[PDB]
């Protein structure tokens, strides 16, 4: 879990 | 006798707008000019007093 990153791509 | 009135027609009101120099789509320079239009036209002014 540590080190992961959230990213969202907008349509 | 029935009365008489004088038909009175009001003067037109005009408006003049100055235009600044401009270039159109065909690249011809247009030096400053003006164009006039009528805002309120002439009309009969019904009488304030018939007699």
């Amino acid at each position: 879990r540590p080190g992961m990153m959230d990213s969202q791509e907008f349509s | 006798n029935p009365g008489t009135v004088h038909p009175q027609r009001s003067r037109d009101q005009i408006a003049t707008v100055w235009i600044a120099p401009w270039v159109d789509s065909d690249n011809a320079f247009h030096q400053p000019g003006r164009v006039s239009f009528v805002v309120s036209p002439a009309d009969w002014v019904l009488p304030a007093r018939v007699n």
């Binding site: - | 408006a15 707008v17 235009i19 600044a20 805002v39």
Partner: protein, 217 residues
Amino acid sequence: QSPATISLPQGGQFRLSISNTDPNMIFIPGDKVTAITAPGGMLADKRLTRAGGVLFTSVATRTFTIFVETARGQTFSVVATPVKGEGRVYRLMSAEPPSRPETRKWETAQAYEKLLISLNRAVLTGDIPDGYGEVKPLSDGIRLPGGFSVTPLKAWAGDQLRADRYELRNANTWGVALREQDFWKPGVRAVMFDNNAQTLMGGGRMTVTVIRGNGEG
């Protein structure tokens, strides 16, 4: 009361009072609000008015920021602190005119001199074209000769053109001849005097309508 006028650029941050008890309203003179966003659990109700406004109720008591997004592309932020009292109505002027793509099509379909006459007639006759919307008047859009002072009144703006009305006061009380060419500035596309004029009496409250370009500068 008359609705209070905020006038913010498209990043604006205005601190305004809001009422906890009764509904409050925000309207755009020329645009339709499409969304209001606040912190979760802050704005109790939010409904969109038909004209294009939004009515909202806030129950909480802390100062908060709310964001409004209009349809034609716009975003304004207000920080609202809830106080006890009547509902408040605010009118939001754009300060930076919005892009109106559907208006360019009407704007360019006709000739230039015809369009100028049309905008000038509409402002004078009081009916506004459908594609145009109300914007904050420019602080300085015309040159001021002979020690004059100018108070803006109203402004409208489309896509490539922007109309404004300026009230001119002669302060020198000595008689000043009037020429549209003497008010010209880089970007002023046309000038018209509402009264035929040609002269300005010593105390003069007259008006002038200037068309300019949107985005000049």
